[PDB]
Design a protein around this motif. Sequence first.
Motif, PDB file in Angstrom:
ATOM      1  N   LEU A 195       0.818  -1.218   0.000  1.00  0.00           N
ATOM      2  CA  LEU A 195       0.000   0.000   0.000  1.00  0.00           C
ATOM      3  C   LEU A 195       0.856   1.274   0.000  1.00  0.00           C
ATOM      4  N   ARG A 196       0.869   2.002  -1.110  1.00  0.00           N
ATOM      5  CA  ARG A 196       1.717   3.193  -1.230  1.00  0.00           C
ATOM      6  C   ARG A 196       1.117   4.489  -0.646  1.00  0.00           C
ATOM      7  N   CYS A 197      -0.185   4.686  -0.833  1.00  0.00           N
ATOM      8  CA  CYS A 197      -0.885   5.890  -0.372  1.00  0.00           C
ATOM      9  C   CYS A 197      -1.452   5.780   1.027  1.00  0.00           C
ATOM     10  N   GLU A 198      -2.101   6.849   1.460  1.00  0.00           N
ATOM     11  CA  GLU A 198      -3.020   6.761   2.576  1.00  0.00           C
ATOM     12  C   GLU A 198      -4.330   6.225   2.033  1.00  0.00           C
ATOM     13  N   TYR A 199      -4.540   6.448   0.738  1.00  0.00           N
ATOM     14  CA  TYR A 199      -5.804   6.127   0.086  1.00  0.00           C
ATOM     15  C   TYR A 199      -5.849   4.776  -0.631  1.00  0.00           C
ATOM     16  N   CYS A 200      -4.769   4.003  -0.571  1.00  0.00           N
ATOM     17  CA  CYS A 200      -4.780   2.661  -1.158  1.00  0.00           C
ATOM     18  C   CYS A 200      -5.588   1.681  -0.302  1.00  0.00           C
ATOM     19  N   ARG A 201      -6.431   0.884  -0.954  1.00  0.00           N
ATOM     20  CA  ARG A 201      -7.169  -0.173  -0.265  1.00  0.00           C
ATOM     21  C   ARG A 201      -6.899  -1.523  -0.891  1.00  0.00           C
ATOM     22  N   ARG A 254      -6.559  -0.937  -4.925  1.00  0.00           N
ATOM     23  CA  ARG A 254      -7.118   0.184  -5.674  1.00  0.00           C
ATOM     24  C   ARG A 254      -6.946   1.510  -4.967  1.00  0.00           C
ATOM     25  N   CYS A 255      -6.577   2.502  -5.771  1.00  0.00           N
ATOM     26  CA  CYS A 255      -6.359   3.867  -5.330  1.00  0.00           C
ATOM     27  C   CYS A 255      -7.332   4.827  -6.009  1.00  0.00           C
ATOM     28  N   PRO A 256      -8.311   5.358  -5.254  1.00  0.00           N
ATOM     29  CA  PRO A 256      -9.266   6.307  -5.838  1.00  0.00           C
ATOM     30  C   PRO A 256      -8.577   7.598  -6.273  1.00  0.00           C
ATOM     31  N   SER A 259      -2.213   5.377 -10.789  1.00  0.00           N
ATOM     32  CA  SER A 259      -0.970   4.678 -11.123  1.00  0.00           C
ATOM     33  C   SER A 259      -0.543   3.715 -10.009  1.00  0.00           C
ATOM     34  N   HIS A 260      -1.251   3.776  -8.888  1.00  0.00           N
ATOM     35  CA  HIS A 260      -0.961   2.966  -7.714  1.00  0.00           C
ATOM     36  C   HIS A 260      -1.566   1.572  -7.765  1.00  0.00           C
ATOM     37  N   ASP A 261      -2.443   1.348  -8.736  1.00  0.00           N
ATOM     38  CA  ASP A 261      -3.216   0.111  -8.796  1.00  0.00           C
ATOM     39  C   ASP A 261      -2.380  -1.108  -9.171  1.00  0.00           C
TER      40      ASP A 261
HETATM   41 ZN    ZN Z   1      -1.954   5.017  -3.548  1.00  0.00          ZN
END
Ligand code: ZN
Lengths: 35, 53, 166, 319, 50, 53, 90, 293, 126, 261
Positions: free
Chosen positions: B12-18, B29-31, B35-37
């Motif tokens: 998980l790279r973001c705070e927003y990655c699930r 998935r990253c809303p 590019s994080h998917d």
């Molecule tokens: Zn992300």
Amino acid sequence: TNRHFFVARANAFFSRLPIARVQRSLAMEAVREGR
Amino acid sequence: PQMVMSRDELKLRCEYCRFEWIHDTLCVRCPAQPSHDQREMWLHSTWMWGKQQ
Amino acid sequence: ALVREQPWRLSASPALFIQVLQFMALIKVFEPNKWFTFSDHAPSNRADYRHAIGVNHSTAFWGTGEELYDFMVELLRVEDDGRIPTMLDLCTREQMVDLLSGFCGVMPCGKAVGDVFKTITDAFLRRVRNDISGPWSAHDWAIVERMYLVTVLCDAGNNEILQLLL
Amino acid sequence: KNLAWRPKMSERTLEQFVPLHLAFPRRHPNSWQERQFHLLGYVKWPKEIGFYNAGDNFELTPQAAYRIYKQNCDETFWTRLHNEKTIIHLLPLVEQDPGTNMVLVDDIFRHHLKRFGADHYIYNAVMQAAAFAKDFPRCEQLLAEMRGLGLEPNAQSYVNMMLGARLTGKPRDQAEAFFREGIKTGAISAVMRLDTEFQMWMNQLERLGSFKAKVGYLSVNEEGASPMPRDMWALWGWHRTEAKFISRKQMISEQVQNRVRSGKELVGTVYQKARRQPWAKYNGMFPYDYNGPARRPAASFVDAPTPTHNAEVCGTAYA
Amino acid sequence: EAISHARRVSWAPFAQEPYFEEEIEAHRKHHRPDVYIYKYNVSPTHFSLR
Amino acid sequence: AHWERAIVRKNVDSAAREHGTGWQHLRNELGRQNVMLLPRSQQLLAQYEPLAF
Amino acid sequence: DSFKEHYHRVHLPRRLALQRYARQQSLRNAAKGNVKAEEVPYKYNRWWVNEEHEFVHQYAFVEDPEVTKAKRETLPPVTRENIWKEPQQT
Amino acid sequence: RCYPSLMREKDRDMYHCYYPYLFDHGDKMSLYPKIPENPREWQPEQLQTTYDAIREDKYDAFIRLREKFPELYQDTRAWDNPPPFGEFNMFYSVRFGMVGVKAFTCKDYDELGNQFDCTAFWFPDNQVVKHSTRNGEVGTDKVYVGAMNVPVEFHKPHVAAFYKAAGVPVKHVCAGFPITPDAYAPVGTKLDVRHFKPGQEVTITFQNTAAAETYQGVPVWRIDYKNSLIYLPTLLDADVGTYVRFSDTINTKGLTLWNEHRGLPAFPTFIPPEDEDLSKLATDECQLKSPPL
Amino acid sequence: PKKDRRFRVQPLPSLHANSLADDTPLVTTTRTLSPNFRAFALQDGGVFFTHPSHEQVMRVGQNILAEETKATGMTSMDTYVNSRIQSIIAENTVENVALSHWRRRHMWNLVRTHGKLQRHWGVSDA
Amino acid sequence: NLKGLVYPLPYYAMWRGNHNKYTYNKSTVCLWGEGDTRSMYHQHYAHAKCPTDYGRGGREFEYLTVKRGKMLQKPLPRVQYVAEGSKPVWLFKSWHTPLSSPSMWEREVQYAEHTPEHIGAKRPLAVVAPRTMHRYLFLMHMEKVTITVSPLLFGYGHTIQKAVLDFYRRAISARSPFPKDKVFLFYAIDHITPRIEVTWLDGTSYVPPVLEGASSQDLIQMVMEEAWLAADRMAAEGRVLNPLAIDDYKWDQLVVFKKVR
RNA sequence: UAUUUAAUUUUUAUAAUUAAUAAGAAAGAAGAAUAUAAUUUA
RNA sequence: AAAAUAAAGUAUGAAUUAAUAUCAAAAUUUUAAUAAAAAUUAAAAAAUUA
Ligand SMILES: [Zn+2]
Ligand SMILES: [Mg+2]
């Protein structure tokens, strides 16, 4: 296709309709409107 | 989405990655910042036996 | 005529019921396949077989006796105890015999349908039981005998009637 | 190029149509139905004790319930709710024969009263029993005893009173007075004007008319009776996650989750921070969806007394 | 427009969550009063098994 | 040899299945009872002597 | 002889037999003195909105044998002049 | 594009419905699902809804709104008021064609100077010779149309038998047309040429010079209802004398041939007003012609 | 190396490991006529069974069948089967010719034509 | 691949791939809510579909249906709980109106039967309520909030006592938008199950239902939802309600994400 | 020439319930041949 | 691609060729090198012409 509807022809019966007469008729309607 | 070789290579790279499930395949998935998917590589969602082993 | 626009007419007179049924058994309507067969050794399927490229489009399945037979079965198919079939008690005994034989003869098997067979046979027995005490002749024995013959032909022997004759 | 078989379309266009959640051509054989009944640890009982009724719901029998009560009254695990549950289970008996089935209700009543001093549960329950037994004076007497005890009559006490009032064949406005007094008290809260609201309650009772009646929901006595539910994978929900029948050790765990304090999640509220998303969960078959439910030793009855009267058929009990 | 009867505000001049749980009316579904009848939930509005 | 004894066995098997068992049990039990009926003979029994079988 | 066409070869006359068995229902509802054309309930919800939010309509037609029976029996009324004496625009 | 808007059956329900969704109890339609009479068959976690303010109110709005502005909602009336049978449904109905003869070729001018090449077809006698529905199945109905009254001894004896059974005068030729039950005309009907409208499109099936061909688009040019001719802006590849099977081209790329914008057909068939007699009528005044292309 | 087309022995209900016990044979057959097979013990060590005869069994089948069809009435197939049972019990011989034959040949009793050429039970010179 | 009779409807047959060629099944392949799923129970479709209406399955789906026999058209449903002759009041709801106003959430046609006179109400109540999570107690239409606890009632660990007092601790805390002067704590002498009581600008009082095992946030949630309901109920008398500083349901907001580099 | 395709088996009153991508008395000229089913004709 | 000539035909009657069973159609894999060899699945009617 060898079926009956497609093979049989009406040529023999053409004398029942006056092709020459109608052609001349629409030639009259050809000159009446001036084509 | 980038296809990782197994579940462990997921991260998980973001705070927003699930984490999310696509039909038995585990993914990220990253809303935001798509590019994080990441897909864990596995069978196509629709496969038959003769077609895919 | 006798099913769609005048459905009453067949129930009214059993005479023409048995007539239609018998002519219907004479030509064999339920094996159209033997209309197209010139040799019994090579039975033709002309009536039973179609292809999607259009072989046998004309000779393909024709409902032929379908509505007629089914309908005049459903005239005898009233098994309800509230009302016994209205045409069957209008029938003379030998008439009943000949209409059972008619059914028996129409089918491709040469054996009548179970419900019909049961209905008629049982209607005939309850007639015979009543009549045998009253006025009776040797002719009416012949009727009963050629009832029992039909019965054996449809493979249900009637033990009752048989033990009446013996 | 037959088009009935290999249509002219992209697989890209066509792969929306491959069902990944398939419903009708079902995946559970019959052989398994019974097996997966044991895996969940359920038990087959004789039709006397109870059964799975037409909606595939396990319901206890009255006279089965009363006996369970008679044995477990003093048990530590027996709570005040269990009492009123039993009393509820007795209602059809109560109505069909008010004379000899009321005495049981009073056993439960007095017993409950000496184990837990007095409660709303028990008073609501017995007063409903009296409501079906068609004794109005018993109901008013009960209500007076509530108020005298300091028990503040609950919204259900007023509904019990409207029910008693109604099916005891007494005029309207004795029920209307109950509903209005109940609304002044702040027990019932009505949103519409009083008349129409009351009409709604009355219409909701007459749909529900009692066990002896000619019309009502309670007036239908036919019960598809089965030792085991005729489908084991039946859903109460949307997904296969939400399935109606679950293991007894799970149905324990959730009962635990309920009775324990709410610290993580909301309760008694309409929000539910965690929303239902069954479609989001894992969709794929587990190995038990091929080889069938795992085998657990079937529930057995050791040394059950010989079945005398095995010829006789037991009667369907609403009696 | 292309909007359905439900979700349409008035007649005067989705794919991400396919299922719903049906709504009781607003003033009813905030705290919803429990009333027994012989093991049925009976409201002025709805019926249930519990 | 295999084709034929396959046939015989099949017949004995179905003749046992009418009675609610199969070749797989009856073989073993016939051995245990020391009966010593050849498969061909159990077939002759099944077809021409049903009560005996 | 492929699989499919042998299948249909066998089963086409059986389909016919089965729908014939469906037919005889109305016959026993005929002989008993009743005469009725089995009625199909009118389906009120044919109008829909799909996930992409656009209008989809379901066309549902119901043939009436009592109308048809009259349409094969007798002529139509006279063709209105609004039709043939003026053309159909393109 | 050439696909309609896709809709799955799992998606048609109360929340996706365009008009109010209706539940069917079978004697009665209500907006609440049917509550099972045996209460003990109710499922856990299922509400039985006798009344719902939300859905009932929206409905209430809808109805009163429909009555007070009938001019705005006249389309909505389609929901509540279905068209009866017969009466030419624009989407449903299909009529039969008729059997022609390629007679000669011609040349015509439109309003402007342009040289058209017309093929003239002749429909000598068109009757409805046969009705055939196959085992009573739906959409299987055929009307067989015959052409060209013909001497007793023309056909092989087995055809003559067919015409004797039917009751029709013996024809040289027949063709079947698949149709919908409303498009039936009684056996023995005389068909006219004005069964076709001069502005429409027509599907033509004939014999090529040597298998069967189909031209699906071809518009109608001009029509003689005296000499029972018809004209097409085309050069066929066909023999003079060739019988040609005529039909209506039912749709062109998402568009129905028959609609209020374009026009309406003479539905089961053209029928002539009894007062007219073609015997008093000349060739010229008998003409019907298309609008400009 | 060719695929095996020989006929297979059909699969049988799984035994529960209670079959590993001695004295419990793994053939489980308890059927309707089972009590009728009585066992006696020969001095050889062989056994001796006493059972009903062929047609006693078949007549039992007949009783059961008739008793199944008493309520609804016999359909044609039950009539045919009862017939055949009845014959097999009384057989005394072996049946070598198609059952349908006798009916085919006797069909003229069922379907009667007009009286001109109409056939009777003796014909010529009448 | 279209032969036989072809109906003039522009494309019915297109989605199953242009042919009419099977059509004689009454049975198809089904997701939930498709045809033969008629008989299985599902929460959603049980209340969302009439189960006479289940049609054919996947890409085979009826754009066109032709059946025979007479057509039975049942009369439309008539609306319950309204007496005839009653002249209703009409409301105008438009997209023009934002979701911030209560004018969106209520009956579009308002009768005099559906107007409660218990409370003063000129117009009937709303039918639908917005749903969010209320992190803080904020003064809305409430003019007072009373919290009554008997310290004589006592215990160790997590109890409803602790929950209610924690409600208080939250309301009077630094981050609370609630004005700290309007929250009143009361020690009671005799054995009172701790209660929270909020009094509105109407003079009506609400008591949240402290459940066994209730925690802090449930009480907050409850009080705020109830506050919306009563804000509406007061709006129905004709009280004129001032706008609210904080917006729990964020109507005019988009979910924003932070940046990348 | 084997296979493989394409055509044909010489009017089938009629065509499509499915596969794949359809067949009624017979051979001279199909024309009494210079496009009329007789252009009046000894 | 128009024009001229040559193909059903009566009669005469050769030549190349010929391991074969009434034949060998379609696909997939394997086998020491096309594999008309195996094995599996399958679905090839007759006549005549190009
Ligand atoms: Zn992300
Ligand atoms: Mg050997």
